[model samples]
Target: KGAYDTGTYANLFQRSGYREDEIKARLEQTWNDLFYGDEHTRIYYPVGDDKGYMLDTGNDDVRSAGMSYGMMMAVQMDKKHEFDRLWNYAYTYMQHTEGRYKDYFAWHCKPDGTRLSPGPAPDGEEFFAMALFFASNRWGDGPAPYDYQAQARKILHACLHQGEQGEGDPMWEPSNRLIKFIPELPFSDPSYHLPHFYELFAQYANEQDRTFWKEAAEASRAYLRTACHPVTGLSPEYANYDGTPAPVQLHGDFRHFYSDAYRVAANVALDWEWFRKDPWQVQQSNRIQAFFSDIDVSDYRRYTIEGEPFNEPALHPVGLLATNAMASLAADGPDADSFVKRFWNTPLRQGKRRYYDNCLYFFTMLALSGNYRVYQQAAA
Candidate 1:
């Protein structure tokens, strides 16, 4: 059994002292800004035939990451039409039926549906499977491609066993159950481990494969304990299976707390909210909040997990703030309330950086407003 009472998962926003009306209003407004409010922060673009892509405007391409996120947003809001539209767009363009990425999605694509790279990102694949599973449980499976459960199973199968029959590697390193930066990489992105979702997968995945997800959940929770710094609570963007930061690579320096690492706090917070498996998450949340409590949002900088700041400014300070606020779900520190109140006053980020910031912003809004939740069929 999971740690938290399944019938009584806490919605932090509702439990917080904020006005109920204000919380709901902010959630609605944030959702509108991202999906429909304006051209800048708005991501979804409609194509004919009830199809659309969530544009990654800064990169001038579509990404499986953004698409899966949109689907998750839609499902949580009970917007089946929007969810289907985005899924159709993804199936039509991003998913691969054959070749090296078979059953995996092309991670990046042109807005017009052209593949930019044939490579897959495990983060996106994990989100895609999770969203599909929720869709099946909430809305019920439909026809071929949209048969949500089957599609989710297929994605999970490919993620774990892609090379068994023939060509490519699996998204996870089979030996450790840690998600890779890509299918072929030995290193993993700390942000990609969503133990909360893995708990759901354990219950919903194909029976033959259920045990893998159960162990994956335990592995991820244990992995996070080491990946996060004991004092600062910051995680490196990339790390080896043993939880040490991966070496700086030709592609970019990822040994510091940066954009990708921001998600770690939010993931840990959600895991605790759903399962309450680790009391350490509360301490982890407090440590991260305490580290940033003295810094101004604009002054946010890249930092090593040891709490040393670099000269470079953060690429997504508002996004970082959003995650920190979301961290309030698990944090019991004196600084937790300050983060949440400050986030309530901040608006959605605009301009080129908006894509990532607003994505984080919307998710934070969902979580803080008590809307980000598990969607599943009612018990019989």
Candidate 2:
């Protein structure tokens, strides 16, 4: 009864009265700011020859998360040279040649391409594969690591069967298709649920692996339904397979809504915009937007899932706002218009924390402008 016919996307910003010329102009400025503008948020650093890395300015390190995000931004904007540079850096430094993370990339490394940690993050691998696949569909393959389609499939294959032959662990639980917070971990981060990406994986992955991607998409939607609070719609940074918040550990009590959890609403909104498999997304988007409708950005704080504010302020208020604003993609509540219009007036974040905030800001910009899109293999 709630099947939302999926077709071409709706450019919500254009529909909301933003001129096409203006939207493009803003997007250009945003992209330039991150790659070329003032120092703080400028993440792309050119290395030697044709390679470059996306530095995590706040942390003084390069991370797979930022590099893959840079690739996605480059591909969506059709910036071929920049995309190649970022991919080259990742291939040269982050990818592991042996051990439990053999096929995976190191999650963090120094600017000079020295490994900071040999461990891998599943979120990074997922984004890396998705970006590579999109690059192939949008611009076709190149050589070796730049052979986008093949590189993407290789990563996915490794992700699903990494431990099957012997020592390493799979990024996802083999029995259930839920992605783990880390290969060595048993639980998952709620923000890792990107059903929209999974939908594309189902279509582009190798024939035998496609069914798992489809099931993953459905499983994620159902998982999110339980992970988020029934009233507040807030999700925890990490949760068990059954969707209950995981207990506090060395990472500090992630049981409360914080940085990583902010992406859940944004992800759900985009999934609905792309596939519309779950009618609950529309309501869920509205619910989250409504949850923060009255909170001032400067006053944003950590909160319990039921919506009680903690004493600590948010480290990335701009990022949280960007996610809430992006939720308008599927949000039908009256507050949706107010949120988007407010985001239009807001400027990109500055200072140390700008890396994370600006990334989310740029993505929110893409989704709203109709620039973030689905790329199919046949198009190549």
Candidate 3:
């Protein structure tokens, strides 16, 4: 049974025999290191009272993805002040209130709160909606933007209905119910598929949209089956609605399994842990762990879905390892525990590129320790 039904989550770290206090201490240390450590280790920066941002250190910009991730981390850790700060920054700077992008957030911004790009990335919006809903459940409503549940509903409403009058494009393709990489795009990033979040949205979004969220959950689950390689279980960074690798575009080629693809393993495992609605997730997790078992982290590289490694070194190897370890949540293969052990020995990445790796790292720690949870509204 899943946590939603049984009201209990499996603590993988404790199951692996780590002491409770030790696990708690390590989680706290990791959180502090990422949020309050020295310049090299910290990604969060408070701008002023009631506002903050997560820096994409490698790119030296504040991305909506990172800011939303900060909110998610804060809510999970019960850091209400930090959560509000991050959300304030995002609402004050990134959100577009007019034009084609109205109701959607700019995907990236400078530290000074200037827009780097006006385009919205669906991944960030999805995370933003989920985190807001969680804050509502965990801490109750406040006011205006801090009225978490209302804010979440507004986002979900725009995601599905933005283009209805033909002025803008909706984030998801209305016919198929699959999330697009961007509102105007026809393809998807496999890592953006989060059936688990959709399941919760089905229950909490505006009542009129409940059926849509439920269909989205089922659509994404089926999409992943085709998006992932049958043998190696690797998925391309971007794929078509039918789940084939998308054609290379002018900006870049994303047909290979690379940075964006690393999330697939962790996402699949999390969905399995929370719902257990799909038997395929177990085999998928096992296949991915098995594929990575023989390779050392230092040898991590961009690879073809068939497991062919390229000369290009992985930009965030620690992040890749973290996700592999997280896959142990649904992986029952012989190498499952070994992946968890490997991840336990790896410390948070601490250089310019540490931002991405450590974000994934913090989430993996939350999952393995069973601190990542679903917050349901208390009964009146």
Best by lDDT: 3
| Residue range with the least summed lDDT across 10 consecutive positions in model 3 | 161-170
Q: Write the per-residue lDDT of candidate 2 for residues 165-256, one digit (tens) a residue.
A: 67899887978899999898899999998888888888888789999999999999999998999998899999999999997879588898
Q: Which digits, one per residue and each the tens of the lDDT, describe model 1 over residues 1-380?
A: 23335655445666667788878887888777888877767877878978988888788899999999999899888888889999998899999999768889999999889999999988898899989988998889999878998999999988888898788999877688777889887988899999998888888888877888888998899999999999999999999889999999898999999999999999999888778888999999999999999898989999999999999999999999999999998899999888888888899888876888888888888887767788766764
Tens-place lDDT digits, model 3, residues 1-380:
89878779889998888999999999999999899999999999987788999999999999988998999999999999999999999999998888888879999999999998999989999999999999999999899989999988988888998877558888989899999999888899999999999999998999999998999999999999999999999999999999999999889999998889999999999999899999999999999999999999999999999899999999999999999999998999998889878888899898899999999999999999998888887674
Lowest lDDT sum, 10 consecutive residues, model 1, at 1-10
Q: Whole-model Cα lDDT per candidate?
A: 0.87, 0.87, 0.92
Could you tell me the lDDT of residue 241 within candidate 3?
96
- Residue 262 Cα positional deviation in candidate 2, in Å, after optimal superposition: 0.8
Candidate 2 ranges with C-alpha deviation above 4 Å: 1-7
Per-prediction RMSD in angstroms?
A: 1.5, 1.8, 0.9
* Lowest summed lDDT window (length 10), candidate 2: 1-10
Model 2: colliding residue pairs: none
